[PDB]
């Protein structure tokens, strides 16, 4: 018994949790997923690894989970763990709603899940959840919001970020192009298309390969929509027709 125990909730000599880091490595080999904040909304854009000629497509999405009428999330890592965590997030949101009769602030939801993940890192002897998450939402306290959480139960708020394969490059590119206080949903969409176009291994980029969702505020209600393939192709074509435009100048 002491022999077979892999000891998953234990410090390493350098003062770190090996399983958490290895989980981060698992995340690194997952579909690229990024999120960008704006002044009139916030968006998620993710690489689709479920891209085969014989897939049936019965769901609204693949990596975009609706959590709440004012909140949505995207994921990267092991998908089943993502199903678990997303279900739990929904549960938490509904508990808050039952208790206070008003929507849960996004930060509170993220923290609530992150404490569970942390708990998994500290005791139990179980493997952690090989999953990182991006949260987009709106609330009456901080308006439009983008968050990110790691399997360590560690989270942070961002104006723009990426997660998954080639995340670092995407982050650098975002650091270049971003526009604090001067961001719009259109511009942010362009930026997403750009970074996704460079980071994705498979070039050219078909709508069959990307998945975009926006969260915006219309008439007192919160609207979350997944972009149809047509709009996506419009965005890509726009990107190429702008890229072939700046290359003329030489």
């Amino acid at each position: 018994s002491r022999r077979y125990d892999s000891r998953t909730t234990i410090f390493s000599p350098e003062g770190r949790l090996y399983q958490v880091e290895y989980a981060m490595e698992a995340i690194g080999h997952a579909g690229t997923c990024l999120g960008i904040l704006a002044n009139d909304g916030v968006l998620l854009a993710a690489e689709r690894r479920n891209i085969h000629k014989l897939l049936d497509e019965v769901f609204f999405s693949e990596k975009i989970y609706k959590l709440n009428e004012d909140m949505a999330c995207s994921v990267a890592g092991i998908t089943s763990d993502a199903n678990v965590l997303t279900n739990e997030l929904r549960l938490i949101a509904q508990r808050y709603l039952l208790q206070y009769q008003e929507p849960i602030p996004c930060e509170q939801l993220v923290t609530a899940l992150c404490d569970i993940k942390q708990a998994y890192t500290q005791f139990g002897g179980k493997r952690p959840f090989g999953v990182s998450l991006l949260y987009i939402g709106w609330d009456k306290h901080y308006g439009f919001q983008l968050y990110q959480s790691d399997p360590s139960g560690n989270y942070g708020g961002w104006k723009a970020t990426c997660i998954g394969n080639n995340s670092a490059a995407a982050v650098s590119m975002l650091k270049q192009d971003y526009k604090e206080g001067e961001m719009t949903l259109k511009s942010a969409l362009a930026l997403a298309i750009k970074v996704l176009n460079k980071t994705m291994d498979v070039s050219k980029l078909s709508a069959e390969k990307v998945e975009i969702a926006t969260l915006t505020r219309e008439n007192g209600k919160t609207v979350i929509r997944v972009l149809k393939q047509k709009e996506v192709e419009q965005l890509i074509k726009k990107h190429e027709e702008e890229e072939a435009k700046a290359e003329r100048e030489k």
Partner: protein, 204 residues
């Protein structure tokens, strides 16, 4: 009785391709009225409302936990809930407290979100479902409401006539009950729109 502690009345009525649900507005404690704007009808999706009469606490609580489970349903599955399914859900929720029941007798009224076929039902305090093709009632003035509904209800009624009928039934039944009234509210729902009205009523 426990049900008569706060009083109140809830009614639902079938139409052609429409449906109606109504309730009084009084929140009182025994003989004393506290408020005249108490909500007893709750939206459980587009074209699907639930009416709760009885003990006010359990009205609010059942409504809230119902919204809880319903939201979870509409998230796990990618669809609004069907009326029969909502009825079974409420039935389950109430029967979970078989030996310590919530004191409410719910009434469900809605259109099939896929079709448009009207659906109405009512349940026990322990969740025994009952579907009809005409009307359902629940409240301290049940006998009164039965009396009115049996004499006013016609089969294939249009929205306006369904409205007039359910309104007259509610008004005249409630006006013979001391712990029901202080206003009436009617939701008449059809395929394209939802009309919400408050009736001119006695306030005594």
């Amino acid at each position: 009785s426990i049900m008569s502690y706060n009083g109140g009345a809830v009614m639902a009525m079938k139409g052609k391709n429409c449906v109606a649900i109504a309730a009084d507005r009084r929140f009182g404690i025994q003989a004393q009225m506290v408020t005249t704007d108490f909500q007893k009808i709750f939206p459980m999706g587009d074209r699907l409302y639930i009416g709760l009469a009885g003990l006010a606490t359990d009205v609010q609580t059942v409504a809230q936990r119902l919204k809880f489970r319903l939201n979870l349903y509409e998230l796990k599955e990618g669809r609004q809930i069907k009326p029969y399914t909502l009825m079974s859900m409420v039935a389950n929720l109430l029967y979970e407290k078989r030996f310590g029941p919530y004191y409410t007798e719910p009434v469900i009224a809605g259109l099939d979100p896929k079709t448009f076929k009207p659906f109405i039902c009512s349940l026990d305090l322990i969740g025994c479902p009952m579907v009809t093709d005409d009307f359902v009632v629940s409240g301290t003035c049940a006998e009164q409401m039965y009396g009115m509904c049996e004499s006013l209800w016609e089969p294939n009624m249009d929205p306006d006539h369904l409205f007039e009928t359910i309104s007259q039934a509610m008004l005249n039944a409630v006006d013979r009950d001391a712990v029901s009234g202080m206003g009436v509210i009617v939701h008449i729902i059809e395929k394209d729109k939802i009309t919400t009205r408050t009736l001119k009523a006695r306030m005594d």
